[PDB]
Design a protein around this motif. Structure first.
Motif, mmCIF file in Angstrom:
data_model
loop_
_atom_site.group_PDB
_atom_site.id
_atom_site.type_symbol
_atom_site.label_atom_id
_atom_site.label_comp_id
_atom_site.label_asym_id
_atom_site.label_seq_id
_atom_site.Cartn_x
_atom_site.Cartn_y
_atom_site.Cartn_z
ATOM 1 N N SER A 18 0.852 -1.182 0.000
ATOM 2 C CA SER A 18 0.000 0.000 0.000
ATOM 3 C C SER A 18 0.893 1.239 0.000
ATOM 4 C CB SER A 18 -0.937 -0.029 1.204
ATOM 5 O OG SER A 18 -2.011 0.880 1.041
ATOM 6 N N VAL A 19 0.918 1.963 -1.123
ATOM 7 C CA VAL A 19 1.783 3.130 -1.278
ATOM 8 C C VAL A 19 0.948 4.375 -1.551
ATOM 9 C CG1 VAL A 19 3.710 1.729 -2.086
ATOM 10 C CG2 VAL A 19 2.119 2.735 -3.746
ATOM 11 N N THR A 20 1.605 5.533 -1.611
ATOM 12 C CA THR A 20 0.950 6.805 -1.884
ATOM 13 C C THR A 20 1.572 7.449 -3.115
ATOM 14 O OG1 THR A 20 2.431 8.206 -0.577
ATOM 15 C CG2 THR A 20 0.641 7.118 0.592
ATOM 16 N N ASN A 21 0.882 8.467 -3.632
ATOM 17 C CA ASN A 21 1.393 9.211 -4.776
ATOM 18 C C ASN A 21 2.579 10.088 -4.398
ATOM 19 O OD1 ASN A 21 -0.542 8.059 -6.390
ATOM 20 N ND2 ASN A 21 -1.407 9.999 -7.120
ATOM 21 N N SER A 22 2.617 10.582 -3.158
ATOM 22 C CA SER A 22 3.694 11.440 -2.679
ATOM 23 C C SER A 22 4.806 10.651 -2.011
ATOM 24 C CB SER A 22 3.145 12.497 -1.720
ATOM 25 O OG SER A 22 2.528 11.894 -0.595
ATOM 26 N N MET A 23 5.072 9.444 -2.492
ATOM 27 C CA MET A 23 6.071 8.560 -1.919
ATOM 28 C C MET A 23 7.228 8.378 -2.891
ATOM 29 S SD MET A 23 5.602 4.671 -0.614
ATOM 30 C CE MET A 23 4.309 5.188 0.509
ATOM 31 N N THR A 24 8.441 8.369 -2.354
ATOM 32 C CA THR A 24 9.628 8.162 -3.165
ATOM 33 C C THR A 24 9.933 6.675 -3.298
ATOM 34 O OG1 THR A 24 11.283 8.173 -1.408
ATOM 35 C CG2 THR A 24 10.457 10.302 -2.180
ATOM 36 N N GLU A 27 11.429 5.134 0.011
ATOM 37 C CA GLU A 27 10.403 4.746 0.975
ATOM 38 C C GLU A 27 9.645 3.515 0.509
ATOM 39 O OE1 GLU A 27 11.494 7.694 0.684
ATOM 40 O OE2 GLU A 27 11.033 8.993 2.388
ATOM 41 N N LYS A 30 11.815 0.682 1.493
ATOM 42 C CA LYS A 30 11.714 0.449 2.932
ATOM 43 C C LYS A 30 10.426 -0.287 3.275
ATOM 44 C CE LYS A 30 14.227 4.767 3.523
ATOM 45 N NZ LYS A 30 14.048 6.232 3.737
ATOM 46 N N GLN A 34 10.072 -3.959 4.980
ATOM 47 C CA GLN A 34 9.307 -4.217 6.196
ATOM 48 C C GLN A 34 8.492 -5.506 6.129
ATOM 49 O OE1 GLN A 34 6.950 -0.688 6.960
ATOM 50 N NE2 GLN A 34 8.621 0.376 8.022
ATOM 51 N N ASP B 62 -2.331 -1.602 7.112
ATOM 52 C CA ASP B 62 -1.692 -0.917 5.994
ATOM 53 C C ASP B 62 -2.348 0.431 5.724
ATOM 54 O OD1 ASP B 62 -1.826 -3.867 5.909
ATOM 55 O OD2 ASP B 62 -0.301 -3.679 4.340
ATOM 56 N N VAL B 66 -0.222 3.791 5.867
ATOM 57 C CA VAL B 66 -0.271 4.734 4.757
ATOM 58 C C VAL B 66 -0.621 6.133 5.252
ATOM 59 C CG1 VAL B 66 -1.714 5.388 2.816
ATOM 60 C CG2 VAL B 66 -0.599 3.173 2.849
ATOM 61 N N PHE B 69 2.337 7.577 6.940
ATOM 62 C CA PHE B 69 3.332 8.066 5.996
ATOM 63 C C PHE B 69 2.890 9.383 5.378
ATOM 64 C CE2 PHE B 69 4.836 8.492 1.655
ATOM 65 C CZ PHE B 69 6.203 8.458 1.842
ATOM 66 N N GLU B 70 1.595 9.518 5.104
ATOM 67 C CA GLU B 70 1.103 10.730 4.466
ATOM 68 C C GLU B 70 1.170 11.921 5.409
ATOM 69 O OE1 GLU B 70 -0.150 12.495 2.087
ATOM 70 O OE2 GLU B 70 0.040 11.133 0.376
ATOM 71 N N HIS B 73 5.410 11.518 7.070
ATOM 72 C CA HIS B 73 6.494 11.245 6.125
ATOM 73 C C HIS B 73 7.557 10.356 6.764
ATOM 74 C CE1 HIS B 73 5.752 14.686 3.006
ATOM 75 N NE2 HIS B 73 4.621 14.151 3.428
ATOM 76 N N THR B 75 8.669 6.022 7.709
ATOM 77 C CA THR B 75 8.534 4.606 7.396
ATOM 78 C C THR B 75 8.927 3.744 8.589
ATOM 79 O OG1 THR B 75 10.673 4.841 6.285
ATOM 80 C CG2 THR B 75 8.697 4.717 4.895
#
Lengths: 155, 283
Positions: A18-24, A27, A30, A34, B62, B66, B69-70, B73, B75
């Motif tokens: 589960s990721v975001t649009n503002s994620m590099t 990250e 990482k 995890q 998750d 998320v 993280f938002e 920022h 991890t």
């Protein structure tokens, strides 16, 4: 915004993170580490046959829910001799591994110059290097330069 | 049957999720460590007034990872735990406003924290994680518990530990937008372009061909130093030696004000154990 991204490693595995649009990409690595167990610096991601830079954002790469990435973790085994600088200018050489924690490097430079473990900190390429994290998470190149600062313990 | 109560759980206090409690304080089974308004209540039975109340839990999901993280920022799954452990103490701290600036009455070795807070209130800096931005706004409003706990969480420090102001600023600058800054004929850019472990005096650059930053900082080991009014923005003083001591803050707003916890000292000139000096920079 936020969505699931599929990761495949050249086989029957297609696991979603589960990721975001503002994620590099760092990250992302990482987050993969995890749940996969391999340190993030060993990982290398590729979308549509294109290596992803660890500093770039997923939005800048055109990634979305209707996309999949291919992961290959690298097989680092060799150590490296790196240069540690002193706040007064002194330079020393230490043979370390990318899998060793920063705590072990602080112990090494301590035993080298007899300074308390809690009496100083260190930083590579302007980033303060956290204690319990691995060295490879900072991109330690062979024969690179690491700075050491004496933290003024006060309060 | 079981007399239960519905509550909300969150990690950023923006996205709330409805959950059920059965009048049991054993949050460790399914709920996890919980903090009502910053104060841990992992072993507190649900009150009758615990209706439509918002609780803080750590990312077990998750979705929550998320959202964390938002908003932060980060991890690190223990980041929220560290932040809430710091907040459970900083909630009881006092934050007196001194002539527009917000400090801390000293408690649990918050000397370096108070100095960093007083510094960040006088330098132009925009944070990238929304948590830091909102905490900074609330701090400049007078409530600084969340900001100080966040600072402790981002530096992996705990309430009571000793601390160095320069390393705290260096940790904070990683979460700040400093890519626009440049300095040289060795080219530098970013956090390395606004710091110098060396000469306290900016004007002492005779041993720096250009600067392109909104502010700069210099730092030396604690030296008896005379601060001239109007030459700098703010500075920090370290009374003691390296192993132990205490930090005071000095500002040059109209006169050489000196903040020590909740104490204020006025002076036309100043001479003391200076260690960091901050300076305005247009370009």
């Amino acid at each position: 915004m936020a969505w699931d991204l599929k990761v495949k490693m050249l086989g029957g595995n297609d696991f979603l993170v589960s990721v975001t649009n503002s994620m590099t990409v760092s990250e992302l690595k990482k987050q993969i580490a995890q749940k996969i167990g391999v340190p993030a610096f060993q990982q290398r991601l590729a979308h549509q046959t294109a290596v992803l830079q660890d500093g770039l954002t997923l939005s800048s790469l055109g990634l979305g829910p209707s996309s999949t990435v291919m992961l290959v973790v690298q097989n680092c085994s060799e150590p490296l001799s790196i240069l540690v600088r002193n706040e007064r200018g002194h330079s020393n050489i230490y043979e370390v591994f990318l899998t060793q924690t920063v705590d072990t490097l602080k112990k090494k430079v301590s035993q080298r110059e007899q300074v308390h473990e809690d009496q100083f900190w260190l930083s590579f390429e302007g980033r303060p290097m956290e204690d319990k994290e691995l060295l490879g998470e900072y991109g330690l190149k062979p024969q690179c330069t690491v700075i050491k600062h004496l933290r003024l313990r006060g309060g | 049957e079981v007399r239960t109560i519905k509550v909300f759980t969150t990690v950023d206090n923006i996205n709330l999720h409805t959950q059920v409690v059965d009048m049991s304080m054993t949050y460790g089974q399914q709920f996890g460590p919980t903090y009502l308004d910053g104060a841990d209540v992992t072993k507190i039975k649900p009150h009758n007034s615990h209706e439509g109340k918002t609780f803080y839990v750590l990312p077990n999901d998750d979705t929550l990872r998320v959202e964390a993280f938002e908003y932060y920022h980060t991890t690190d799954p223990s980041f929220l735990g560290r932040y809430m452990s710091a907040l459970n103490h900083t909630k009881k701290w006092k934050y007196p406003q001194v002539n527009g600036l917000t400090s801390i009455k000293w408690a649990d070795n918050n000397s370096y924290l108070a100095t960093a807070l007083l510094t960040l209130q006088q330098i132009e800096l925009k944070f990238n994680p929304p948590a830091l931005q909102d905490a900074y706004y609330r701090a400049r409003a007078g409530e600084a518990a969340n900001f100080c706990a966040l600072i402790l969480a981002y530096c992996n420090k705990t309430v009571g530990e000793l601390g160095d102001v320069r390393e705290t600023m260096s940790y904070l600058f990683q979460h700040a937008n400093l890519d626009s800054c440049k300095r040289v004929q060795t080219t530098l850019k970013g956090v390395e372009a606004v710091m110098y472990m060396g000469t306290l005096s900016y004007e002492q650059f005779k041993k720096l061909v250009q600067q392109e930053s909104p502010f700069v900082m210099m730092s030396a080991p604690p030296a008896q130093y005379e601060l001239k009014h109007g030459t700098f923005t703010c500075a920090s003083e370290y009374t003691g030696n390296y192993q132990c001591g205490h930090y005071k803050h000095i500002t040059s707003k109209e006169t050489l004000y000196c903040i020590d916890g909740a104490l204020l000292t006025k002076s036309s000139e100043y001479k003391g154990p200076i260690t960091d000096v901050f300076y305005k920079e247009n370009s």
